[PDB]
A paper describes a structure:
The conserved tyrosine was replaced by phenylalanine at position 191, while the conserved glycine was replaced by serine at position 285 in [name]. In our work, F191 and S285 in [name] were mutated to the conserved amino acids, and D161 and N288 were replaced with alanine. The variants, D161A, [name], and N288A, did not change the specificity but dramatically reduced the enzymatic activity (> 90% loss of function) on p-NP ester hydrolysis, demonstrating their crucial roles in the catalytic reaction. The unexpected outcome was [name]: most esterases have glycine at position 285; after mutating the serine to the more conserved glycine, only 20–30% of activity was detected. Substituting this serine with glycine could impede this interaction, leading to the decrease of the activity. Despite the fact that S285 is adjacent to H284, a residue of the catalytic triad, the crystal structure of [name]-[name] did not exhibit obvious relocation of the catalytic triad (2.7Å for H284Nε2 to S162Oγ, and 2.6Å for H284Nδ1 to D254Oδ2) compared with WT [name] (2.9 Å for H284Nε2 to S162Oγ, and 2.6Å for H284Nδ1 to D254Oδ2). The distance between S162Oγ to the carbonyl carbon of ester bond was 4.6 Å in WT [name], 4.6 Å in [name]-I256L, and 4.0 Å in [name]-[name]. Such distance could allow the catalytic process to happen.
To advance the understanding of esterases, we have identified and characterized [name], an alkalophilic esterase from a marine bacterium [name].
Author numbering: 4 to 312
Amino acid sequence: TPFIRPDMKAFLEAIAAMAGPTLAEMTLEEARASYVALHGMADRPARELAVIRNLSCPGPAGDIPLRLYDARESREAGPVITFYHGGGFVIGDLDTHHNLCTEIAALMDLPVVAVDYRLAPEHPFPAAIEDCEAATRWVASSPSELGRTASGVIPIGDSAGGNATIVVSQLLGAKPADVPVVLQVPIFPLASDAVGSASLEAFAEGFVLTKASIEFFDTAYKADRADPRGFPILGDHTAAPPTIVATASLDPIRDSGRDYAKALVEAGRDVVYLEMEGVTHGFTNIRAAVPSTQGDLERIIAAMKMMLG
Ligand SMILES: CCCCCC(=O)Oc1ccc([N+](=O)[O-])cc1
């Protein structure tokens, strides 16, 4: 069998005990609420921070809600992290990933702006990308409402948010914002299509993210398999910014992350590839229920500090 950490295994056994309906069998509101509840019970509590403020910026469909996290009430110009939550582009919001954002802000000592991007099925592909790109460009412009000056931006996100991370970096690479992407951090991202991958078959059931959920999200979002904004493995990697790709060894979409990191090396780009051993997809948000995942997040943080100099 594949290696599973004991604390990870205990969580998986509890999920199996819970049982219950699939995402597709729930109403959309129920599916979203179930994600809120899982992260509410599984993640470590929020860090206390000097600044936690709701903002918004203009976007192509209307205003995009944002949340700013900063350990400092005032700070000098520097890079700003721009965070896109996971949830298949269907579930998640500013609260499902709130505690993680406070942790990133506390441990990095950099401001974090999370994006409340439009969700499918109500807003299919590419709505999420439109909002993540717009909000990242907005942050990169150092607007007065932000109260911080950005010298560069650092896209980061988990799962669908890691897909968005890569797409945003490619879009800004092609048409720069007011400051560059100085580092991108796609965490267990969807980069290439997982269909047909060995990891999707190996981890299709019993590893938190299921093949059934992947198919549910896909039906809702409707990304075009030939569009690099849906599957950014298809994009131009020759000028990719410095990158940290973090995956999980038990992740059905693990191989998608492997593929992306291999493509960056193939294009001669600087990349840190970290594959956390014995944990699942979503490890960034289960840091109380599976305490060893706090250390996995701390390794990403250390890699980010190193890559930033
Ligand atoms: C209850 C399942 C939680 C998985 C939600 C999540 O952690 O965010 C994801 C985002 C995107 C994809 N995907 O594109 O396959 C999978 C997961």
